């Protein structure tokens, strides 16, 4: 597409903000709040569309994690109600498949989800697949070739170094090579035929460090870390870089976004968002 898309995240509480980022220029465009705030959700793209999957609206009032998925169309500029999930996903990951949503892990409560659901478009539905081998919350999630990947993410009573492969023809997981680093709460994304795994928190303290899973030898390696340490970031591509946005860094919500260049293997600090927040979905499509 043209345009970075963050929705929601967390400072002080869940937030509603959408807005977007042109890499081309530098500029920032506030665009229609999300109708109920949220952190831990995740974004992602289909048809032109933006989705807004997940989370939980941690407010003075209360803490309601959400099954909501939530459809914004940048031609009108509003967001829409789209089919609840079966079940609320704090911390989800999210990965689109053939124009399908995979919807994955995440938590209600104290519950932490194995369970995965895909949602269809064109029928407006959801419907659960095989469960994931292991439950994740704060699991990152990428497609390559049309198989979807878990990687990370905290079971309920540990942080992981373990990932996981969807194969959808035969709707079943398979556990692959682990990372090299225990990563919860991370950034995953693909770029050219590798998973990018960046960030996280490791159950100590959160990551700069930044690896790659390349799908035919089957082995991590790590790359150039990041210039901040963060969890709980945002992440995208767009036009063969990866993009980081905000997190949590130890001490602060941050508000930089860098950008990683595999030609070079370099990171750069490209720009801020508006106010520091970690938590948030990130997607790209085209301008409003
Ligand atoms: O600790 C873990 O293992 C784990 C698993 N999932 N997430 C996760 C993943 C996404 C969002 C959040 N929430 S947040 O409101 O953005 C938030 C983050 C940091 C501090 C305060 C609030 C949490 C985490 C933490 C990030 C490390």
């Not at 519950?111 to 269809?120: F, L, M, N, Q």
């Not at 198989?147 to 905290?154: D, K, M, Q, S």
């Not at 919500?253 to 508006?274: A, G, H, I, K, N």
């Amino acid at each position: 597409g043209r345009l970075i898309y963050t929705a929601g995240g967390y400072f002080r509480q869940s937030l509603s903000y959408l807005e977007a980022y042109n890499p081309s220029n530098g500029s920032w465009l506030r665009l229609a709040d999300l109708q109920v705030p949220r952190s831990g959700l995740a974004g992602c793209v289909v048809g032109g569309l933006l989705y807004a999957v997940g989370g939980r609206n941690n407010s003075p009032d209360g803490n309601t994690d959400s099954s909501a998925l939530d459809c914004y169309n940048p031609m009108t500029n509003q967001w829409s109600p789209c089919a609840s999930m079966s079940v609320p996903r704090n911390r989800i990951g999210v990965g689109v498949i053939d124009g399908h949503i995979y919807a994955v892990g995440g938590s209600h409560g104290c519950i932490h989800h194995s369970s995965v659901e895909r949602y269809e478009p064109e029928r407006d539905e959801w419907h659960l697949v095989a469960p994931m081998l292991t439950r994740r919350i704060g699991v990152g999630v990428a497609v390559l070739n049309r198989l979807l990947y878990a990687v990370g993410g905290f079971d309920g009573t540990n942080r992981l170094n373990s990932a996981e492969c969807y194969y959808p023809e035969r709707n079943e997981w398979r556990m692959i090579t682990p990372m090299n680093t225990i990563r919860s709460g991370a950034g995953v994304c693909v770029l050219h035929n590798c998973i990018y795994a960046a960030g996280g928190y490791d159950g100590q303290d959160q990551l700069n460090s930044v690896e790659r899973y390349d799908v035919e030898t089957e082995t991590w390696t790590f790359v150039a870390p990041m210039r901040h340490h963060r969890s709980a970031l945002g992440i995208t591509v767009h036009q063969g870089k990866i993009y980081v946005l905000g997190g949590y860094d130890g001490h602060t919500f941050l508000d930089s976004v860098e950008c990683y260049d595999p030609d070079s293997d370099t990171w750069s600090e490209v720009t801020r968002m508006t106010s520091g927040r970690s938590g948030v979905g990130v997607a790209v499509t085209m301008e409003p």
